[PDB]
Specification:
methylation; 8 strands; binds the ligand Nc1ncnc2c1ncn2[C@@H]1O[C@H](CO)[C@H]2O[P@](O)(=S)O[C@H]21; membrane; lipoprotein; 2',3'-cyclic nucleotide 3'-phosphodiesterase fold; eight-stranded antiparallel sheet; 2',3'-cyclic-nucleotide 3'-phosphodiesterase activity
Length: 214
């Protein structure tokens, strides 16, 4: 009768830790970077001092356990489109199956810290096509929203990560030069507190497609 809270790909303990660690390294490096410090007044909007901001602290709300990539939030069936999504053959067939998710970039905004996921064609079959889509997904390839949440600002909800990624991708839908080089790739400053690290080598994380119940 009733559905999960949401469906998605859940990373193994190992892959989760690899990505989490990479995310944390990025926050530390990004926060220490001259280009980021230079734009602090576009990132925070209060009476903060001239001092340095520690981003690991800023993104204080982090996933407590394994990371995941949400496909469809269902709220046990209360969410629009949940039933329709869950009844798809491909969803039922893929339930419990192993997949690999390709991580192409890490990003930061004043609201969230996340990882961009680039879904395979097979995985795109599990991406919902709802009647109620975020406006921002329009004009971009299906599944562009696909992401993993690494942290959130205090009053932010994990759903914002996907939304932030869509806004970043609309922003880059030409592309200017990078403002820095980090060990894992090039750093871009997209304005309005938004930052993207484009990985030289995509990370591959193992995960299982399944349903989460609160
Ligand atoms: N209305 C929504 N649409 C899409 N995803 C959602 C929605 N509400 C919550 N989520 C996501 O579902 C999970 C549990 O709330 C979280 O994983 P995470 O993708 S990081 O962001 C959250």
């Amino acid at each position: 009768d009733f559905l999960p809270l949401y469906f998605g790909w859940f990373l193994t303990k190992k892959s989760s830790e690899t990505l989490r660690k990479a995310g944390q390294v990025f926050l530390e490096e990004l926060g220490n970077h001259k280009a980021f410090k230079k734009e602090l007044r576009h990132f925070i909007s209060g009476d903060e001092p001239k001092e340095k901001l520690e981003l690991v602290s800023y993104f204080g709300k982090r996933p407590p356990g394994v990371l995941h990539c949400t496909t469809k939030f269902c709220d046990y069936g209360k969410a629009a489109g949940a039933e329709e999504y869950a009844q798809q053959e491909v969803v039922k067939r893929s339930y419990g199956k192993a997949f690999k998710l390709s991580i192409s970039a890490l990003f930061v905004t004043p609201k969230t810290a996340g990882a961009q996921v680039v879904l395979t064609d097979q995985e795109l079959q599990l991406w919902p096509s709802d009647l109620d889509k975020p406006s921002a997904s329009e004009g971009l390839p299906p599944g562009s929203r696909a992401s993993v949440t690494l942290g959130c600002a205090a009053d932010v909800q994990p759903v914002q990560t996907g939304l932030d990624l869509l806004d970043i991708l609309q922003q880059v839908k030409s592309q200017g030069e990078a403002v820095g080089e980090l060990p894992r790739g090039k750093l871009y400053s997209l304005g309005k507190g938004r930052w993207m690290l484009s990985l030289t080598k995509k990370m591959e994380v193992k995960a299982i497609f399944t349903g989460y119940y609160g």
